[PDB]
Amino acid sequence: ATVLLEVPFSARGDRIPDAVAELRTREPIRKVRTITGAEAWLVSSYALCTQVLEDRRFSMKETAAAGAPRLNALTVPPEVVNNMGNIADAGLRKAVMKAITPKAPGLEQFLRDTANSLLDNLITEGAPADLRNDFADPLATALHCKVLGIPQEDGPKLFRSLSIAFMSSADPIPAAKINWDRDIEYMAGILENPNITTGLMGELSRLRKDPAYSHVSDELFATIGVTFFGAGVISTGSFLTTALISLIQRPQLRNLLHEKPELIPAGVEELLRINLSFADGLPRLATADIQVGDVLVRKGELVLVLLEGANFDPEHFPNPGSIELDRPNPTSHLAFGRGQHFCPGSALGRRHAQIGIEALLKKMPGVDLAVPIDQLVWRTRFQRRIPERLPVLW
């Protein structure tokens, strides 16, 4: 006898397991066991992933219901699982969405300046350099302080909550509550702090005193700050780190983007498509009995949408493991999700990566790994796949 197939399959974010394609061919929806011991349906074709993400009877917020089968333990209060629903119900969606585009005057200049400063520091100090801790993640952290309107010097302490906040644990995590409560208190103080007048938090600070929002809770305003900083920083920092590995691995693409930087947006879209940064399928709970391929999913069951199952599906993306800058469907990947919960940070996340890559290629056109690729240490039991350090030379 063998056990029920366990997820996740591998924490390594530099290569997809050959097992994913086998799985998608033989059983593109199949039962698995999660780290909590719960059963779930793992969906791994493009067709069935899209079906689940576009059908709201597969619910995000019902994953937080007490007693549901769980992918992992909550690290936020259960009402925060419906965060963007709560933002929309408060009449804040338009405003929040507006504040996190890359469009604000000065923002792109700020990202280039910041990327260049981090890279000049690395060049002064001499190789090897850690492009996760000393480039991608500080770039993400600086970006999100600017987008929120909060002091750059408050970035590092907020960032150090994230290695716990974004854990994928079988059990509740006592430090996640300590850091959540502390970070909520910080964002409630930001809303009361008259120096904060710009960015997302400057905007929510004004809307909080406007009569159209007088009954929106102070708790929701603070929660938007904590959640958007943390999710945006983890998602952009982790994507840019694993995208740099994929680029550094492909010297010809490196050289092509360095020579023709106008191709960087197409190259970032393919780096998004192939990205392995999400460590787990996206979870949903069925609220009805729903047919998915050859399975009737029953009400109350957990479904996990494997993004790399969709994004490496050769029926949708032929020669799926190759980066090709001339595909006829380049933005049709699921790296930002699909449907009701499609990422509102997508444009910002694209621009963070495009600017970080353009700056890296101009400053370190010879960038290469400084260790054999197998020596990267992949973080485990985390909601993202990320190497703990990314040592490079140039």
Ligand X SMILES: Nc1ccc2nccc(-n3cncn3)c2c1
Cβ-closest position to ligand X = 230
Please return the burial class of 12, using the count of CB atoms within 10 Å of its CB with bins 0-12, 13-18 and 19+.
middle
Binding partner of 44, given ligand HEM, ligand X, none, CB within 5-8 angstroms per partner class: none
CB of 277 to ligand HEM, least distance (A): 6
Piece of 28-36, 177-185, 286-294, 307-315 that binds ligand X (CB under 6 A): 177-185
Nearer to ligand HEM, 22 or 342 (CB): 342
How far is the C-alpha of 79 from the C-alpha of 23, rounded, in Å?
34
Counting residues that bind ligand HEM (by CB under 6 A) gives 19
Residue 223 engages ligand X in binding (rule: CB under 6 A): no
Cβ-closest position to ligand HEM = 345
Nearer to ligand X, 5 or 343 (CB): 343
Residue 136 engages ligand HEM in binding (rule: CB under 6 A): no
Report whether 75 belongs to an annotated binding site: yes
How far is the C-alpha of 16 from the C-alpha of 9, rounded, in Å?
10
Query: Which residues ranging from 4 to 43 are in contact with ligand X (CB under 6 A)?
Result: none
Work out whether the CA dihedral 126, 127, 131, 133 comes out positive or negative: negative
Binding partner of 213, given ligand X, ligand HEM, none, CB within 5-8 angstroms per partner class: none
Counting residues that bind ligand X (by CB under 6 A) gives 19
Q: Among 44, 45, 235, 275, which residue interacts with ligand X (rule: CB under 6 A)?
A: 235
How far is the C-alpha of 229 from the C-alpha of 162, rounded, in Å?
10
Residue 165 engages ligand X in binding (rule: CB under 6 A): yes
Binding partner of 239, given ligand HEM, ligand X, none, CB within 5-8 angstroms per partner class: ligand HEM
Cis status of the peptide bond prior to 8, with omega within 30 of 0: yes
Residue 337 engages ligand HEM in binding (rule: CB under 6 A): yes
Residue 159 engages ligand HEM in binding (rule: CB under 6 A): no
Residue 81 engages ligand HEM in binding (rule: CB under 6 A): no
Binding mask 37-76 for ligand HEM (x = CB under 6 A): -----------------------x----------------
Residue 343 engages ligand HEM in binding (rule: CB under 6 A): yes
Binding partner of 335, given ligand X, ligand HEM, none, CB within 5-8 angstroms per partner class: ligand HEM
Nearer to ligand X, 46 or 166 (CB): 166
CB of 3 to ligand HEM, least distance (A): 27
Residue 237 engages ligand HEM in binding (rule: CB under 6 A): no
CB of 143 to ligand HEM, least distance (A): 8
Q: SS in 3 state form for the chain? A: CCCCCECCCCCCCCCCCHHHHHHHHHCCEEEEECCCCCEEEEECCHHHHHHHHCCCCEECHHHHCCCCCCCCCCCCCHHHHHHHHHHHHCCCHHHHHHHCCCCCCCHHHHHHHHHHHHHHHHHHHCCCEECHHHHHHHHHHHHHHHHHCCCHHHHHHHHHCHHHHCECCCCCCHHHHHHHHHHHHHHHHHHHCCCCCCHHHHHHHHHHCCHHHCCCCHHHHHHHHHHHHHHHHHHHHHHHHHHHHHHHHCHHHHHHHHHCHHHHHHHHHHHHHCCCCECCCEEEEECCCEEECCEEECCCCEEEECHHHHHCCCCCCCCCCCCCCCCCCCCCCCCCCCHHHCCCCHHHHHHHHHHHHHHHHHHCCCCEECCCHHHCCECCCECECCECCCEEEC
In 3D, which of 176, 208, 178, 180 has the Cα closest to residue 192?
Answer: 208
Q: Among 21, 95, 188, 343, which residue interacts with ligand X (rule: CB under 6 A)?
A: 343
Binding positions for heme are 284, 341, 343
Binding positions for substrate are 75, 83-84, 235, 299, 383
Binding site for ligand X (CB under 6 A): 75-76, 83-84, 161, 165-166, 176, 179-180, 183, 226-228, 230-231, 235, 343, 345
Binding site for ligand HEM (CB under 6 A): 60, 84, 100, 228, 231-232, 235-236, 239, 282, 335-337, 341, 343-345, 348-349
